[model samples]
Target: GQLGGEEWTRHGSFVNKPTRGWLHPNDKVMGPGVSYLVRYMGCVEVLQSMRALDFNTRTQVTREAISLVCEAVPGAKGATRRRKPCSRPLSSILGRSNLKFAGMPITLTVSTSSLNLMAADCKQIIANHHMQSISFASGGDPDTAEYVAYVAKDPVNQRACHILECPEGLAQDVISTIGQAFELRFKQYLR
Candidate 1:
């Protein structure tokens, strides 16, 4: 068992906040529109939505569905027919950054493919496999940005959320629906 397991008794772990506040600031994420449930819901809902369209979980497999167009045309008959491989770790390919969103610490990760899609071609490549880009809603009221549930096709087509700031009650219902949807979609993986 992990060290935090003892304290987690009766109370959940980082994935879920405890009923009573016993953990430190670092242990417990501090934010205006953040909550463990929100983050979980964001990830799982995106995954679940992709699964509904029969999207794969594996990144490589997911890439298959998205066809990237290259500006270079086919080579002349004398030239060889080959395309260079742009191989890189997904974590590396998707740049990560530590920053603040709505005065709350937020980490942003974006993929090269997703970035490429934001160009003049008006073409963005994303998979039903949970590939998403993230951005905050433009406003001072963080809750409005926090409450907006972003799916796909938006200009900033990435998954966005403030886990610690999300409120409970109705918000929790949304989270539960997303979690249940994910369970149904990834049941095979869980087993």
Candidate 2:
């Protein structure tokens, strides 16, 4: 993915440390915060989120979604309404580096959209879509808590552990905030 595409906002006091120990002096993410999600999302994904798809689009994910947004239109009335034609997810062939989250002082953001990680400087879009299932409380010392989970799947093979350093007292608030984000948007709700 391209860099410098979206803006950023600080999330919590946590630091996003890679599962691998630091390879060099500045090899970890500290002071990470929240950031935006994507650019051209699938049309039905957007419209579906708006309830325009009548819930049927739940079964209409990849191929159907791709061609709808990917097929180039022959022409348009000034093409004003054609700017965002629905973008496909980052394809699986982009290379490991492309699939990776840049480890540095970054930010974490949660929403009704997708949970995201951002650079502290707020330029490089680190990663997102880690909301499927967050890891239960485990590692870390008694005083300091850690937010542990895996991310990725450019369709799966690259899935990885992502631990954010958090304070023992504040992790619960952070946990509920993300779950609330899931409940409001990603969850099935009363359906």
Candidate 3:
């Protein structure tokens, strides 16, 4: 939420490994940080952590969160506001690379709004909206059968929120949740 965008601070060690790995030299990420969750992110994922040392370690969480927001949203152009500016998530490798976290056609964009709105309305922005599937004769795009679950920060001072778009309505599916739970350290909250 800073002027140049929110900074992420990663508290960990660093590795001098090549940007790629045995699968491909470019298969890996070389920047900073020694630890990585192969299940949720890619090599370049650690680059932000590496760059954080130059700023302040305190912002590691913020940086990681922003990184995730970018990763989760598809085709996120950028983030900006009257007071703060932020980085759009890197979607360049969505369908390439061997990284488990890459290749998803999803991108997220974030913005800050100062409009006069009630906090309850903000909370409502992040509620579960069950989608109704159409029958065979309904005649419509199958891709339209999707759902979104929302969660927000404190209603009075609501800050962070997420609206995940899941194909096949698998947002809370067993496999996805397990994958998310395994990547705990990669993100602040599992949901």
Candidate 4:
């Protein structure tokens, strides 16, 4: 409750997650949750040499990161979501019509491909094992094997999905190592 005077007060939450109710967030839970997301996104970015994470996480991280950097470096909160569009702001004043606008649109692509990698990591692993078992138990050579390779293709490459965002054609050892690292980092959540 509010036990302190106005000039000095404590900020606290009445209802918190089980672990959060304790003085500090349980290291076991917070550490892995934070580590998994950071490492997972970093791996994807390094692998593809581009921004990664599902559209939601990507947008949330983007907003939070930008907010942090801007506030830290410039001592400004930047812009509020409620701000209106300025048809002609500083850019227009300088004869740059398209350069600056009061309200900038942040496009967040929440498409299936954005979420596919996470799904493949959890669901496809089981399916892949099943397929491998079927192929090996049949005693057929991989090249001339009775088993057929499944390739679901789309121009956007939506069909390419596998465990931990490591799709087909990646070096087996490399993929395995990445997967192992991801799982190891994720295990901290369990304490």
Candidate 5:
């Protein structure tokens, strides 16, 4: 509760969200002789790609987790149904592939003050990182649906940046929606 302030300007939800939490951010270039940008658009692009898991692909992940868990524990010796309660000790086991299981199907709220990640149904807190002097950019083929965000000095120094991925068209919608949030905030100050 150290972040003890809430001045919400905008909030929204997303789907099929992919995330790479806190890494060496891949910086991109967008300037000179091209379209200028909005102040928070970079963060917009970053947050859009951060996380908001989808049962669409997430169903597949859940299916595998269920299968893995079921496969492991049934070896527990109940009234002994069909087989042994065994967990396969594979080199690449239950928690290996992150893109498959890491991203949460959660809601992302980007206000003028900070970015909030929360559970969709239960409203649980995931990460409520502030929107202060953070930078975001895409580093790979856009077709790969990957984007990145870099934070140089988070107080705890734990999460510095993240890799954000999402499906097609979704990126546009996300970037567009976020820009609108900033735009609306800007327009609100008209007096």
Candidate 6:
């Protein structure tokens, strides 16, 4: 109802096929019903079409949708938790070293020999536990537990993925060796 020149509005039914046209600010229209569409239909219709609750919440809806899609994606994996320092004997000692390498943040996805061959073929490692490969060899025996490392930036976090392979039997020792080498190289930067 229009009370004292105030505009009244009602949401109309969806149109199966509506003719398209550009409506200037001063376009022709009847009363409130059509004028309502003219005034707010562009945004309103988009929000409704997307099934969004409202414009204010549209981004939240989109983020949730993207998150849902990511979860369902074949190779989209969640973040892998690094091993706790307490789990390893020397890790605590190494952790105490106030060393800062002059390098960028990195993320590594190692493909160890222990990983399921089928799982290794996927874009992202299916096993979060596989992250332990950070200190494990990609393949081969303890004598040849060399680190084959690579670096790539994480798309979401902008961090570098310093993916490296460690020998399964000598992961910790090999990692410590590599860590020592790294520290020596950056000794000048060590705090």
The clash numbers for all candidates, in the given order, read 13, 9, 16, 0, 8, 8
Model 5 TM: 0.31
Which lDDT tens digits does candidate 6 get at residues 31-102? 211111000000000112222344233233222222222233313222112222222221111112111121
Q: Per-residue lDDT of 1-191 in model 4, one digit per residue for the tens?
A: 77756553255643755433111243322132211110011101101112334322322222232222222223222432323333311111111111111112111111111111122233321112111111001111321111111111222222211111112322222222222112122123224
Question: Which stretches of model 6 miss by more than 4 angstroms?
Answer: 1-51, 79-191
Model 3: per-residue Cα lDDT over 79-101, one tens digit each:
21222424433322212112233
**Overall local distance difference test of candidate 6:** 0.23
For residue 119, give model 6's deviation from the true position in Å: 22
* Consecutive 10-residue window with the lowest summed lDDT within model 1: 65-74
- Candidate lDDT scores, in order, read 0.25, 0.31, 0.26, 0.21, 0.29, 0.23
Model 4: CA > 4 A from native: 1-57, 75-185, 189-191
Query: In candidate 5, what are the lDDT values of residues 81-113, reduced to their tens digit?
Result: 333333432222224212222233445444332
Give the clashing residue pairs of candidate 5, or none: 22-161, 53-104, 53-105, 74-85, 75-84, 75-85, 75-86, 76-85
- The regions of model 2 sitting more than 4 angstroms off are 1-103, 127-159, 167-170, 174-191
User: Could you tell me every candidate's TM-score relative to the true structure?
Assistant: 0.19, 0.28, 0.18, 0.15, 0.31, 0.15
After superposition, the stretches of candidate 3 with alpha carbons farther than 4 Å from their true spots are 1-106, 109-145, 156-162, 168-176, 181-191
* True-structure lDDT of candidate 1: 0.25
Which candidate tops TM-score? 5
lDDT, candidate 2, equals 0.31
Consecutive 10-residue window with the lowest summed lDDT within model 6: 36-45
- Winner of 1 and 2 under lDDT: 2
Weakest 10 consecutive residues of candidate 5 by summed lDDT: 24-33
